[PDB]
Symmetry: D2
Subunit: 169 residues, 4 copies
């Protein structure tokens, strides 16, 4: 019912996307990270392919995705890769690709670690398609807060810290 990828798998996901890019002859000049789920994949992919330029976008998904801020300079004539962690509906990556296009880049391609089966728009690069609810390492405590019955490690150490946090407000 749950897919809980290890860090070891996350690295494998980054490798696969990296290789796919090199074999497709698409070496990005600029990485656009989707805040905040794309933060960690973008950084890892940056280190792998030696991509020194990373920019960011603050977009949240509510009926439609909403941009809160755009953290980038001129992207004109550049090859851009948008990176998020999981494409569920696919609307987020589409919305980001839509706004980045307005920057007149050479090309915008999209990427995600995992894909959901019935997404409207499929990313250009991805590792695997999973039919389960995905618990990333960087949002595990977000899930435990909604349901502490999920099978994740170090849950006891969290709840002790969690309680003390609530004993303040």
């Amino acid at each position: 019912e749950y897919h809980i990828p290890s860090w070891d798998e996350i690295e494998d996901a980054v490798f696969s996307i990296g290789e796919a890019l090199v074999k497709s002859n698409y070496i990005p000049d600029v990485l656009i990270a989707v805040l905040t789920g794309g933060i960690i994949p973008a950084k890892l992919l940056s280190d792998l392919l030696d991509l020194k330029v990373i920019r960011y976008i603050d977009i949240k998904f509510y009926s439609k995705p909403v941009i809160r801020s755009v953290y980038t300079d001129s992207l004109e004539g550049k090859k851009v890769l948008v990176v998020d962690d999981v494409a569920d509906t696919g609307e987020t990556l589409e919305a980001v690709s839509n706004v980045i296009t307005m920057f007149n880049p050479a090309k915008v391609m999209t990427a995600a670690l995992y894909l959901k089966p019935w997404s409207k728009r499929i990313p250009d690069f991805y590792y695997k398609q999973i039919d389960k609810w995905i618990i990333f390492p960087w949002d595990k405590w977000d899930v435990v807060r909604e349901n502490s019955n999920v099978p994740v490690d170090k849950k006891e150490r969290f709840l002790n810290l969690y309680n003390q946090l609530l004993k303040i407000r």
Copy 2:
């Protein structure tokens, strides 16, 4: 008469007309978004007039020269925090094609604001897209006070004040670039 060269006095009345039209329509903006850099002077003046304290900016340019860019205005940067639930007014100086205000209105909508409305001082009759608020509809080449020297450098035959002083300064400037 070929060029329309509006005085600073006309610019003020242009700003007043917009502000008055805003109050009549009961649309007091929570945020002013200035189009860089042609609309940053109308935005500032309108801000002072209606006591609008929040001003944000967008760096967008439109090269109409032929023609390595398939038309389309080009965004270089967007300078703003969240605009969700906010009433937004976009301000530029002239709607020639109405395509810049079109491009800005589209990206601001993605911020999910309560409402976006556009405004430009002048409008061309051939402008495909029309701003919500505008002062006057002109059919001639407009030389603004904040781009007159840009025009002078492009055409030295324009009848503008203090030109002789500029050219001297310009000559000293080219001698060291």
Copy 3:
């Protein structure tokens, strides 16, 4: 008691600063405009000397000046000119020069249209020193709202608009 510069004088102020720059052999690569008083001088100076690159800083003066946001990209190895409309205490220009320095530019110089007699830090470029309270064209209605007895033009047309504005909230 009041100094109320015409637009004609403002242009003269921009000219003087422009010439001073050219004769000092300091042609700025980037203009940093101080929001929002430096907005209009920076634009005019940009048009005069053909300076295509303008960036901005949102700083407000309360006991000390406060930065709200900084709107600029990399300034490394560039000649920077900070532009504001009036230097009263001089603390604002100093604070902006202090933060811009952290961007490792080639050089930071400051400029203002008018200077006040007893400022702590004097700008590098300025038009005139005035001992009176200055009412700029772009903040005249800010002064009328604090005191509608000031001798400025079009005051009647404002107050009629002003009233209708108050008849809403």
Copy 4:
């Protein structure tokens, strides 16, 4: 032993230690400011741990090579709205000289926040400036999981996993640049 190569497991415990130290000190940040790009992974993980929803960023770099820049960290961009009255935590991955966290703390102070405090995962004993919160004090070269390939490209003799797979990818990469 020459390099310290922390596992993802150690990184998590490093983040936990900070979070626990934050609660003990009764300092729950209103805003997390990540140092780009070394601290953007600790910031995200700490954010998830303590349910901190507001994250801002600063693009600052420190070239320690000799030596056309008189030392000093160099700010390239600051990505944040107003921080006035806010409790702020700055997050980087390692305090080697403590000069970056020093430079960031100085510019954030000018935003007049309620309070700024700093935090780094690791600390060097020769670090002139000490972070408020840190996990462990290391005296060796640290190879983080998010910069291991950067180190490999600089020194190919480092004992890191999946290196053979990287080098193949690297060879295909250099053949088309």
